[PDB]
Design a protein around this ligand. Structure first.
Ligand SMILES: Nc1ncnc2c1ncn2[C@@H]1O[C@H](COP(=O)(O)OP(=O)(O)O)[C@@H](O)[C@H]1O
Ligand SMILES: Nc1ncnc2c1ncn2[C@@H]1O[C@H](COP(=O)(O)OP(=O)(O)O)[C@@H](O)[C@H]1O
Ligand SMILES: [Mg+2]
Ligand SMILES: [Mg+2]
Lengths: 74, 460, 55, 460
C-alpha cells in the first residue's frame, strides 16, 4: 500500500488536491500494465474543502452553497 | 486575422473583449490557441460594451489573459450525412476513434428552429420492436418518443442496445446515438458490441463524456439531433437514441450556475423547461421523413416528482417503467407490465385484438397480485378451482414476457430471439385462453415465440 | 363452550380494532405536526439559499 | 508610538488603517484606549490599503472612529506552566480571581501548529469510569478523546462533572478546565467545589463564559488548549475538560458575516471545518506526553445532522450521544446506546466477553425499536411469545442502564453509586440470558450493581 495523507488541519487546497495526487500515483502503475486499487476516503470532505475555496473566491454558490462545478470536480 | 483578447478566466467561463464594431453574436464559436491545442468557445452572453461571456468547450487549463481570440462567424458546425455512419465523434464533430478525418462533404450548424405545426405529419404507423413486452404493453408510432424510466442497474442501456440491433438488422433503417453524459466504460462496451454485431455500419455515434466541461456535455444532444435532422431531410425514418436526459438537465443546471443565473425550485436552472422544449420539439415526424426517438430517464432517489422527470413527462408518448425488483427476480427485460403506458394503446389505432390481449394480460396480472396474499396466509389449497387456474395462467404470462436479447448473450451465453408482434399476440392470446395449461411454467421462461415454449416443454 | 368462545372472539376483535383505529388517528396528528415543521424548514432553507446567493 | 487609526466599527469587528510600510501581520495583537480602559484587537485579515480587519477582545461600545491604536508586534500570549495551576485566567491570560499577578516565567502564543505525524502515539490502555453505560457501550482509553453530544438540558454537564469526579481526582497529573461560553454560575460552583475539596492546586481554570463578547468566546478555547499543550510538552499526562466546544464555532459564525465572507450551508462560516480541525487536531497525545480530554458538544435544535455536530463527530474517539426522549423518561444517564460508540469496542482491545455483552445489548435494543411501531398501532398483545420476551428484556435493560450519581445527589436524594466494569458486564450478561426474568422493571431503576436490584425487588 501507499498512504496519502491530508489531515483536518491542512490548507483547504491540500485537501482539495489530495485525491488527484493519489490518482496520479495510481496511474503510474496503470499505464505500465499493472493493477492498482485507490481508496478515496471522504470525497465529501474534498467537496467541503472545494466549497470553502470557491466561497472565499466569491464564486456564485449553487445548491447547499456548493459551487456549480462540483460534478465536473468529481 | 484575430481581433479579440481574453480578459478573464474563472473556471470554464472565459470573457473576451472585442472592438466595438465586431462583437460576436450569441452562440458564435470563437477560437483560441490553448498552447498547441486549439480551443473553441461558445458565446453565451453579450454583456456590457464589447465584452463577451463564453463557455470553453475544451478544458480551460493553461489559458492566460491577453491571448488572441479569432471569432468564427458561424455557430459550432458539424459534419453530417452518410460520411458520419460508423464513426465516433465529439460535440465539435471531430473524430475520436483515431480512424483519421471524417472526410465530410457538408457542415450544418447545431442551432436551428423546430418545424412549425403546419409542417407536421399526423401518423400512426406503429414500430415493431423485437421485444414482446414493449410491443404488447407500450406500442409507439413513428415520430413518437419513448421514455425508459427506472432506477440504476435496471437495464435501460442494454434495452437501448437491443432496440438499436433489432431496428438495424431486421428493419434496415439508420440510427443515431447521442451519448450525453456518457461513461467511457459503457461507451467502449457499446462501440464493441455494435462492431461485433455487424450493426456498427448503420449507427452514427456521438459521445459527450462525463469528464468534459458542462456545456460540452450540454451541446451533444443538439449535435446528435442535427445529424438525425440531416438524415430526415433525405427521406429516411431515422431513430435517435438519447442515453440519459437526466444528465442533460444536470449539464444545463451546471452551465446555468456557472453563468451566475439565479437558481430555481430545487436549484435547477430557470430555463429548465425551455431547454427541454428546444430539445424535444425538434424530434418530430414531418411530411418528408421522421425522427423517432427513445430516451433513457434516470429517476433520482425514486420519485417522479422532482423537476427533471416531471418536466420530461410532458413530451413523451410512451413510458416504459423498469423495476429492480423484477430484475432481481431474474426476469429480463425488467418491464413492469402494469405501470407502463402509451397514448397509442386504444382500439382505434392498434385494433381490437391487440387492445383486448393487452387489457386481458393486465387484468390477469392484477388478479394474481390480489390472490398473492391469500395464497401467502391461507395456502394455495384453499383457493377456488377457477382461482387456482388464474394463478397458473398469470404465472405463465409472467414468465413468457421475459426474453433473451442478442446483446445480453455476453451476460448469459444463451442466444437471442426476435419476436414478431403477430407471434406475441398469438402467444398471450393462447395462454390466457388455456391452450397451454398442460405445459410447465419453466417452459415459458426465456423463450422466443410460443413454438419455443412447446418445444422446450417437449424437451423438459 | 365452542360457540360462546367464538362470539367472545368476534367481540374481542371488534374492541381491539376500535382501539387500533384510535391509535392510528393520534399518530396522524403527530406525523402531521412533524410534516408541517419539515415543509416550513424546506421553504426557508431554499429561499435563503437563493437570496444569499445573489451577491 | 500609536501608529494606526480606526476607520470602521461594525459590532465586534473593527477596521484599522496603517501606513503601508508598517501594516501588521495576520494574527498580531493591537491595543486601543477605549475611553479609559485598554482594549485588545486581534487582526484577522489584511485588506489592501494599509487597512486591517480585527476582532475586539472586549466590549466594542464607546469606540469612535479615528482613535489611535498601537501595534503590538506579537500575537496574543498567555502565561503558561506550573505558575498557572490554582488560578482562574481571562482569554488574554490575565488573572480574573482577585489574587495577585501570575508568577509565570514563560508565555506562549495561542496560535500554534499541530504535532507532526511521526510524533503521535496511540494507546489501548482502557480507562475505567464508574458509569455503567459509558464504559460498557463506549469504553475510552487513556489519552483518547471523549465527546458528549446532546441538546439542551439532557445531562452533558452533570455527566462531565461525574467524569471529573471519578477519573480526575484519583489521577496524578495536572488538569485543565476550559469554560467556553457556558454559565458563570456553574463556573463559580465548580471553582468553590474544587477549592473546598483542596484539589484546586492541580486544576488550571480558564473562563470565557456566555456573557462575554464574541472574541473572548472564540479565543478562550485556544488559550486553554495552549496550557494543556505546555503541560503535555513537559512530559506529563494531562486531563483537559472543555465545557462546550460548540460555542467556539458559534462565535465564529457570529463574526463570520461581518468579515465579509459569503454564508454557507445553514448560515455557518465557509471555514467551519477548518476552524474546527485547526483546534481539534492539536489536542492530541504524543510520544512525550498524553492529553485525555472530555468535550461537551451541544447539538442545536436536537438536530444531530446540523453541520456543526456532523463535522465534530469525525474528530472524537468515543462519542456518547444523549437524547431528550430518554431523559423525558427520567432515565439518567440519558445515553442512547444505539448511537453511542467507541474506537475501543473491539474484541482484541476490550476482550471477547465485554464485546459480546455490548453487542447483545445493542441487538435486543434495536429489535425493541423495530417492534415499537407495531406495538404503537396494534398494541402488545399481537406480538409473538418470543417478541414479548425480547421486549421485556429490552425494557429491563433500559432501566438497568440508569445509575445514580454523586453529583446528582442534590436533584434526587439517592446516594451515588460507583459500578465496576466487572459488575456491569456481569449484570447485563445476567439480564440478557433471562436469569432475572422474574423481577419487575422497577427493580432495576436507579440502582448500582444487579445485587442492588435483587434487593430493591423485595421492597417493591
Ligand atoms: N437482458 C439482460 N440480460 C442479462 N443481464 C442484464 C440484462 N439487462 C440488464 N442486465 C445487467 O444489468 C447491468 C447494467 O444494466 P444497464 O443497462 O447498465 O442498467 P442502467 O439502466 O442502470 O444503465 C449489466 O451489467 C447486465 O449484467
Ligand atoms: N443523574 C441525574 N439525576 C438527576 N437529574 C439529572 C441527572 N442527569 C441530568 N439530570 C438533569 O439534567 C438537568 C440539566 O443537566 P445539565 O448537565 O445542566 O444539562 P446540559 O448541561 O446538557 O444542558 C438538571 O436539572 C438535572 O437534574
Ligand atoms: Mg445507464
Ligand atoms: Mg447544558
Amino acid at each position: 500500500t501507499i498512504v496519502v495523507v491530508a489531515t483536518a488541519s491542512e490548507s483547504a487546497a491540500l485537501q482539495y488536491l489530495a485525491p488527484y495526487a493519489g490518482a496520479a500515483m495510481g496511474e503510474y502503475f496503470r499505464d505500465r500494465g499493472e493493477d492498482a486499487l485507490i481508496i478515496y476516503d471522504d470525497l465529501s470532505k474534498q467537496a467541503v474543502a472545494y466549497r470553502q475555496i470557491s466561497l472565499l473566491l466569491r464564486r456564485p454558490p449553487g445548491r447547499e452553497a456548493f459551487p456549480g462545478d462540483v460534478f465536473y470536480l468529481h | 486575422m484575430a481581433t479579440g483578447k481574453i480578459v478573464q478566466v474563472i473556471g470554464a467561463v472565459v470573457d473576451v473583449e472585442f472592438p466595438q464594431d465586431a462583437v460576436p453574436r450569441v452562440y458564435d464559436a470563437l477560437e483560441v490557441q490553448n498552447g498547441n491545442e486549439r480551443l473553441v468557445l461558445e458565446v453565451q452572453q453579450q454583456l456590457g460594451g464589447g465584452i463577451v461571456r463564453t463557455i470553453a468547450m475544451g478544458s480551460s487549463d493553461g489559458l492566460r489573459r491577453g491571448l488572441d481570440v479569432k471569432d468564427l462567424e458561424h455557430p459550432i458546425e458539424v459534419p453530417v450525412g452518410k460520411a458520419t455512419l460508423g464513426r465516433i465523434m465529439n460535440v465539435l464533430g471531430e473524430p475520436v476513434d483515431m480512424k483519421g478525418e471524417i472526410g465530410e462533404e457538408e457542415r450544418w450548424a447545431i442551432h436551428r428552429a423546430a418545424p412549425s405545426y403546419e409542417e407536421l405529419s399526423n401518423s400512426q404507423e406503429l414500430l415493431e420492436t423485437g421485444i414482446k413486452v414493449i410491443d404488447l404493453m407500450a406500442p409507439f408510432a413513428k415520430g413518437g418518443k419513448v421514455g425508459l424510466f427506472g432506477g440504476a442497474g435496471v437495464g435501460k442501456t442494454v434495452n437501448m442496445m437491443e432496440l438499436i440491433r433489432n431496428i438495424a438488422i431486421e428493419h434496415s433503417g439508420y440510427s443515431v446515438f447521442a451519448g450525453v453524459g456518457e461513461r467511457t466504460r459503457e461507451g467502449n462496451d457499446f462501440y464493441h458490441e455494435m462492431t461485433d454485431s455487424n450493426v456498427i455500419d448503420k449507427v452514427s455515434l456521438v459521445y459527450g463524456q462525463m469528464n468534459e466541461p458542462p456545456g460540452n456535455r450540454l451541446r451533444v444532444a443538439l449535435t446528435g439531433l442535427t445529424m438525425a435532422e440531416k438524415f430526415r431531410d433525405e427521406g429516411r425514418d431515422v431513430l435517435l437514441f438519447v442515453d440519459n436526459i437526466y444528465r442533460y438537465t444536470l449539464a444545463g443546471t451546471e452551465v446555468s450556475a456557472l453563468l451566475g443565473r439565479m437558481p430555481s425550485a430545487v436549484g435547477y436552472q430557470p430555463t429548465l423547461a425551455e431547454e427541454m422544449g428546444v430539445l424535444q420539439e425538434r424530434i418530430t415526424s414531418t411530411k418528408t421523413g421522421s425522427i423517432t426517438s427513445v430516451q433513457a430517464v434516470y429517476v433520482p432517489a425514486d420519485d417522479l416528482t422532482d423537476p427533471s422527470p416531471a418536466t420530461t413527462f410532458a413530451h413523451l408518448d410512451a413510458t416504459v417503467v423498469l423495476s429492480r425488483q423484477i430484475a432481481s427476480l431474474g426476469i429480463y427485460p425488467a418491464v413492469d407490465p402494469l405501470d407502463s403506458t402509451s397514448r397509442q394503446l386504444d382500439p382505434l389505432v392498434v385494433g381490437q385484438e391487440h387492445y383486448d390481449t393487452a387489457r386481458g394480460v393486465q387484468s390477469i396480472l392484477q388478479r394474481y397480485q390480489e390472490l398473492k396474499d391469500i395464497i401467502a396466509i391461507l395456502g394455495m389449497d384453499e383457493l377456488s378451482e377457477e382461482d387456482k387456474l388464474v394463478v397458473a395462467r398469470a404465472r405463465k404470462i409472467q414468465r413468457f414476457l421475459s426474453q433473451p436479447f442478442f446483446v445480453a448473450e455476453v451476460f448469459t451465453g444463451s442466444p437471442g430471439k426476435y419476436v414478431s408482434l403477430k407471434d406475441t399476440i398469438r402467444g398471450f392470446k393462447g395462454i390466457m385462453e388455456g391452450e397451454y395449461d398442460h405445459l410447465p411454467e419453466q417452459a415459458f421462461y426465456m423463450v422466443g415465440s410460443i413454438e419455443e415454449a412447446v418445444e422446450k416443454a417437449k424437451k423438459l | 363452550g365452542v360457540v360462546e368462545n367464538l362470539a367472545s372472539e368476534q367481540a374481542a376483535r371488534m374492541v381491539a380494532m376500535k382501539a387500533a383505529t384510535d391509535n392510528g388517528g393520534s399518530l396522524i396528528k403527530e406525523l402531521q405536526l412533524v410534516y408541517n415543521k419539515a415543509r416550513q424548514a424546506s421553504i426557508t432553507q431554499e429561499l435563503t439559499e437563493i437570496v444569499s446567493g445573489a451577491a
